[PDB]
Design an enzyme around this catalytic site. Structure first.
Site, PDB file in Angstrom:
ATOM      1  CB  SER A  52       3.179   9.547   4.406  1.00 51.25           C
ATOM      2  OG  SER A  52       2.446   8.249   3.776  1.00 51.25           O
ATOM      3  CG  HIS A  55      -1.571  11.110   3.211  1.00 53.97           C
ATOM      4  ND1 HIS A  55      -0.830  10.558   2.102  1.00 53.97           N
ATOM      5  CD2 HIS A  55      -0.867  10.770   4.308  1.00 53.97           C
ATOM      6  CE1 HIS A  55       0.220   9.676   2.360  1.00 53.97           C
ATOM      7  NE2 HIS A  55       0.295   9.969   3.747  1.00 53.97           N
ATOM      8  CG  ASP A  67      -0.903  10.574  -1.099  1.00 55.59           C
ATOM      9  OD1 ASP A  67      -1.812  10.554  -0.159  1.00 55.59           O
ATOM     10  OD2 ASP A  67       0.249  10.531  -0.752  1.00 55.59           O
ATOM     11  CG  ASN A 115       4.268   5.087   8.609  1.00 57.21           C
ATOM     12  OD1 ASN A 115       5.501   5.838   8.535  1.00 57.21           O
ATOM     13  ND2 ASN A 115       3.163   5.299   8.102  1.00 57.21           N
TER      14      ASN A 115
END
Ligand SMILES: [Ca+2]
Ligand SMILES: [Ca+2]
Ligand SMILES: [Ca+2]
Length: 340
Positions: free
Chosen positions: A276, A104, A40, A206
């Site tokens: 996520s 994130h 990430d 998404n």
């Protein structure tokens, strides 16, 4: 229940369409000794993360993405992926002009293993586990080759020029992806990580589209996670279809970030929505399951662990509008399964 200040806001851990993590904590399983890798944006030095974060590695090769002055390096600190003046393309689209730092990787990491029962902040699904941050994303995202090298290292693979991973992970969380088919290189590294024994847990994406049109969902040997809401239905943005394996809470997910819009300013907590956010619920539950299996001397291959997770899910709230896997990940049912 844990003593954390904002645990009550984490409906996604304990409420009707949550993952029943609380029921597993009551059984005495918290992901003890299990390592979960998070591929990430890197990690913050957040007071509600530090104790459960092991040193990871920074796989970002391009300093224009890493924002830390160099290529691959031993410090997976999330420098902040903020940008302005369409630095990430798409000019003059008003939606693409600028972005605050996402933090994130830290929001994701906190869902898996935020420090719990330490009074401050939030709880983590597998708060007895440790997280290894594999930084592969920075300003404008990341290179497929950095993501694939990082996920391989995360599992225990050796990358030339990088130290052996002392803490290879049984569960690899990938809250990332883009349009297109799984590349040869990505598929190869996923297969190698799977052969090491790691379950690669990935976001469905998404765009309210078929997740089969995206990677890593279109790869073999991944567990793809769709997003549900606190009402138990599909989150409006969640990708869908036959290649989504199951779902998890993915809207109004409270976790660990920084208040800084660019560089880090102070430890903070925010709600985020996305596949996520669903992904690390599944990675956390996977770690809970492994801690339970460990206690009864049981091995689980990635395929077996995936099957435990998918076959023990709880039901959606009435009819969904799309295929979204078998149901909502259910830690209580999953752990009960492996304990016999
Ligand atoms: Ca660097
Ligand atoms: Ca770095
Ligand atoms: Ca806490």
């Amino acid at each position: 229940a844990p003593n954390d200040q904002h645990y009550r806001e984490q409906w996604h851990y304990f409420d009707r369409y949550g993952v029943k993590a609380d029921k597993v904590w009551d059984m005495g399983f918290t992901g003890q000794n299990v390592v979960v890798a998070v591929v990430d944006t890197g990690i913050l030095h957040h007071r509600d993360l530090n104790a459960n974060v092991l040193p990871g590695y920074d796989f970002i090769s391009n300093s224009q993405i890493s924002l830390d002055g160099d290529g691959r390096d031993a410090d997976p600190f999330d420098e902040g992926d903020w940008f302005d003046n369409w630095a990430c393309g798409g000019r003059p689209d008003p939606r693409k002009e600028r972005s605050d730092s996402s933090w994130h990787g830290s929001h994701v990491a906190g869902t898996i293993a935020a420090v719990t029962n330490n009074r401050i902040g939030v709880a983590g699904v597998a708060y007895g586990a440790k997280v290894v941050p594999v930084r592969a994303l920075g300003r404008c995202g990341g290179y497929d080759s950095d993501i694939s090298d990082g996920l391989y290292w995360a599992a225990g693979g050796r990358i030339a020029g990088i130290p052996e991973n002392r803490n290879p992970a049984k569960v690899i969380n990938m809250s990332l992806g883009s349009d297109g088919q799984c590349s040869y290189n990505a598929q190869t590294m996923i297969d190698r990580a799977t052969r090491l024994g790691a379950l690669v847990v990935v976001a469905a994406g998404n765009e309210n589209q078929n997740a089969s049109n995206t990677w890593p969902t279109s790869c073999n040997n991944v567990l793809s996670v769709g997003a549900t809401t606190s009402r138990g239905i599909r989150a409006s943005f969640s990708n869908y279809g036959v290649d989504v394996d199951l779902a998890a809470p993915g809207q109004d997910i409270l976790s660990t970030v920084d208040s800084g819009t660019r560089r880090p300013v102070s430890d903070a907590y925010s709600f985020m929505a996305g596949t996520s956010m669903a992904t690390p619920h599944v990675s956390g539950v996977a770690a809970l399951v492994i801690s339970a299996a460990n206690s009864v001397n049981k091995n689980l291959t990635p395929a077996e662990l995936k099957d435990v997770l998918v076959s023990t899910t709880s039901p959606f709230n009435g009819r969904l509008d799309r295929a979204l896997g078998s149901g909502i990940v259910d830690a209580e049912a999953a752990v009960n399964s492996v304990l016999g």
